[PDB]
């Protein structure tokens, strides 16, 4: 099958570094420089063999055509109200970027408010964050080009959609919060730096500061409200309390769900916002998370995980702040995770729980925390919501594996609450009743039961003859819940596949204990969990090693890459998207330093000892048995992925091709595709999403020689 030759790639055998007495050779360290002619030549040479391989079989064109047809359905986001107007995002079907619409009432004719599509020919300029003024008459929005995390904030006057001259630069991982007087907005920015700041650089991001921009002035005039010079990794995001009296500063260091919480009573400022605010350090440590829900005077309601891994709601009175005085408004549940909470119609709280990886939604009284109403939902996820304190209605968006979703509306001014379907779209060509979703719990190596969703055509025989697509992430307290994916359904319907999603440790499915179960010294638990999911699908007859494909992105890319090294005999195909592969150097680039709370850091001897055992880049090794080779592998990255710098994938593929690719027994391809004008994934235009999925499934089809089922 392989009719190409791997590119010549220079090995710097002098690249030797000592890690606490452990010598580590990094022959491809030169790939860390994205700007060199050597690195640009490497990328060119790799894409030169990968592209023809993906485009050879006509199955890619069949898949692309079906994806283009089926993905072409109306996509609406949850309606939300700001001031006297309603807004919602909508994509007719195949627009590169969804468009923001506005209407003066729910029965009023909607009009285009902000269309990102006209900002570029290829839809590579996308919205990244936005914030309306308290009165809804002004609007700030961030724009990212080519997938970069970097943002340029722009402003508009809502009435007439008038462009304002205000432009903020050097914005990244930023909050956006307007003061209620309508004078200006808080945001974050990074100091100027040598070299580029467009997403192709690898420069570490430190010393993020909190600024305040007065509308109608130049950015050079902005006020510095908070900075942490002695703590370069600290990031402080601002938000205004519901009553506009307080600025709440949430300081984070790392990716754990914890934050310091400082506040500033704006009325106590000597003469408005003129510099460093009079911060009161309410919670001045990183021992727990405090997520503002609402306040009534000095009594602040926060969602926290402080001695509550499944989360709960507490009320902290600023006038009697000692922890022993906090009141538990909604106690922690023994197993279900309280995902998020919103306050609406003054005294209602909307609580969203995760019960065995499925969402539930309910309304509670703010004064007592008592349950008042349960909003009925099918098995799936709540992916959208609107309803702030002053609002008298809520909208909530639902989705699942088999149907696009439903947007629900509920008028909260009614004595008897009657939620109703506001919008519902079904994809013609994908009959949901032909498939089923089942949830099973399988034991991992240590006996822990791990949840796994399996989606397949009804009536299939569990004889191991079906190709399977197993997905996982496992980390950063992220819960992998049901979502609608046309691309995966095409695999099921047109490639006769079985979809599986394993809720492995590291995730947030069972709270902070689930998270802690897949980090630091116990990161191996993630890999073991995932390998056991594969073993389950195989044993129970859903698939077989030669027919199994595993996929994951970012931390999930690390997941699948490590699994390929540890159990090459268990997988037929592996697709690793934008993955962290060099676990010894990840902290040196862009925002990589933030991930040490999940992974550890090689600077530490103890941590190095954990990292070196699973780091994809440092564990590529020819399988011992003659009849075992590495699975077919496809790494996908982009040149503007400044979240997980592409060097991770570049170094990894060079290593796989040299150590494994050159071996005579290796006949499965080990390829990389580096895209242009794209990044980690957020904001990717529809055109690119379609090309990516077509590539992924064409690769699977060719490597496993699967026939297309019309």
From Swiss-Prot:
Keyword vocabulary terms for this entry: Acetylation, Cytoplasm, Hydrolase, Protease, Serine protease
Catalytic residue list: 554 (charge relay system), 641 (charge relay system), 680 (charge relay system)
One of the protein's GO biological processes: proteolysis
PTM note: The N-terminus is blocked.
Keyword Cytoplasm appears in the UniProt entry: yes
A cellular component annotation (GO) from this entry: cytoplasm
Cellular localisation: Cytoplasm
UniProt modified residues of type N6-acetyllysine: 157
Modification N-acetylmethionine occurs at: 1
One Gene Ontology term of the molecular function aspect: serine-type endopeptidase activity
Reactions it catalyzes: Hydrolysis of Pro-|-Xaa >> Ala-|-Xaa in oligopeptides
Tissue specificity of this protein: Ubiquitous.
Gene3D superfamilies linked to this entry: alpha/beta hydrolase (3.40.50.1820), Prolyl oligopeptidase, N-terminal domain (2.130.10.120)
A Pfam entry, by short name: Peptidase_S9
Role, per record: Cleaves peptide bonds on the C-terminal side of prolyl residues within peptides that are up to approximately 30 amino acids long.
Family from the record: Belongs to the peptidase S9A family.
Full protein name: Prolyl endopeptidase
Species name: Sus scrofa
Taxonomic path: Eukaryota, Metazoa, Chordata, Craniata, Vertebrata
Protein's gene: PREP
């Amino acid at each position: 099958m392989l009719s190409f030759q791997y590119p010549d790639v220079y090995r710097d055998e002098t690249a030797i570094q000592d890690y606490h007495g452990h010598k580590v050779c990094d022959p491809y360290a030169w790939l860390e420089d994205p700007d060199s002619e050597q690195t640009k030549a490497f990328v060119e040479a790799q894409n030169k063999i990968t592209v023809p391989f993906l485009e050879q079989c006509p199955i890619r064109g069949l898949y692309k055509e079906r994806m283009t047809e089926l993905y072409d359905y109306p996509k609406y986001s949850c309606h939300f109200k700001k001031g006297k107007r309603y807004f919602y995002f909508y994509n007719t079907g195949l627009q590169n970027q969804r468009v923001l619409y506005v209407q003066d009432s729910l029965e009023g004719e909607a009009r285009v408010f902000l269309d990102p599509n006209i900002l570029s020919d290829d839809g590579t300029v996308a919205l990244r964050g936005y914030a309306f003024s308290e009165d809804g008459e002004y609007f700030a929005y961030g724009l990212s080009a080519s997938g970069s995390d970097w943002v340029t904030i722009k402003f508009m006057k809502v009435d007439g959609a008038k462009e304002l001259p205000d432009v903020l630069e050097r914005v990244k991982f930023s909050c956006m919060a307007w003061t209620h007087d309508g004078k200006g907005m808080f945001y974050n920015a990074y100091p100027q730096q040598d070299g580029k700041s467009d997403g192709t650089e690898t420069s570490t991001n430190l010393h993020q500061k909190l600024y305040y921009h007065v509308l109608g002035t130049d950015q050079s005039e902005d006020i510095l409200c908070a900075e942490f010079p002695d703590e370069p990794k600290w990031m402080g995001g601002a938000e205004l309390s519901d009553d506009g009296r307080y600025v709440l500063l949430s300081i984070r260091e790392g990716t754990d769900p914890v934050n310091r919480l400082w506040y500033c009573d704006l009325q106590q400022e000597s003469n408005g916002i003129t510099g460093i605010l009079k911060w009161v350090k309410l919670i001045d440590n990183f021992e727990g998370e405090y997520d503002y829900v609402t306040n009534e005077g000095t009594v602040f309601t926060f969602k926290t995980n402080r001695h509550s891994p499944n989360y709960r709601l507490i009320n902290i009175d600023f006038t009697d702040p000692e922890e022993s005085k906090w009141k538990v408004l909604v106690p922690e549940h023994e197993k279900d995770v309280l995902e998020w909470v919103a306050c609406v119609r003054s005294n209602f709280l909307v609580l969203c729980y995760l019960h065995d990886v499925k969402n539930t939604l309910q309304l509670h009284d703010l004064a007592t925390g008592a349950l008042l109403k349960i909003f009925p939902l099918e098995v799936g996820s709540v992916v959208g919501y609107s309803g702030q304190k002053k609002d008298t209605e809520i909208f909530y968006c639902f989705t699942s594996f088999l149907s696009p979703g439903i947007i629900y509306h509920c008028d909260l001014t009614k004595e008897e609450l009657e939620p109703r379907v506001f919008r519902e779209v079904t994809v013609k060509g994908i009959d949901a009743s032909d498939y089923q979703t089942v949830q099973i719990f399988y034991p991992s190596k240590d006996g822990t039961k791990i949840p796994m969703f399996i989606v397949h055509k009804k009536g299939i025989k569990l004889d191991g003859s079906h190709p399977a697509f197993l997905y996982g992430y496992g980390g950063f307290n992220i819960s992998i819940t049901p979502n609608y994916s046309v691309s995966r359904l095409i695999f099921v319907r047109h490639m006769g596949g079985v979809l599986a999603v394993a809720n492995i440790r590291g995730g947030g499915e069972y709270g902070e204990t689930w998270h802690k179960g897949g980090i630091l010294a116990n990161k191996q638990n993630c890999f073991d969990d995932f390998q056991c999911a594969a073993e389950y699908l195989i044993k129970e007859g859903y698939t077989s090693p030669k027919r199994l494909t595993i996929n994951g992105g970012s931390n999930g890319g690390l997941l699948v890459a490590t699994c390929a090294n540890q159990r090459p005999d268990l997988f037929g195909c592996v697709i690793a998207q934008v993955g962290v592969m060099d676990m010894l150097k990840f902290h040196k680039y862009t925002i990589g330093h933030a991930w040490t709370t999940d992974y550890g850091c090689s600077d530490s001897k103890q941590h190095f000892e954990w990292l070196i055992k699973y780091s994809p880049l440092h564990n590529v090794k020819l399988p011992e048995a003659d009849d075992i080779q590495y699975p077919s592998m496809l790494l996908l990255t982009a040149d503007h992925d400044d979240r997980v710098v592409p060097l991770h994938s570049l170094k990894f593929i060079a290593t796989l091709q040299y150590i494994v690719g050159r071996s005579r027994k290796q006949n499965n391809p080990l390829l990389i595709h580096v895209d242009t004008k794209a990044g980690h994934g957020a904001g990717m235009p529809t055109a690119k999403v379609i090309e990516e999925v077509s590539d992924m499934f064409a690769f699977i089809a060719r490597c496993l020689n699967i026939d297309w089922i019309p």
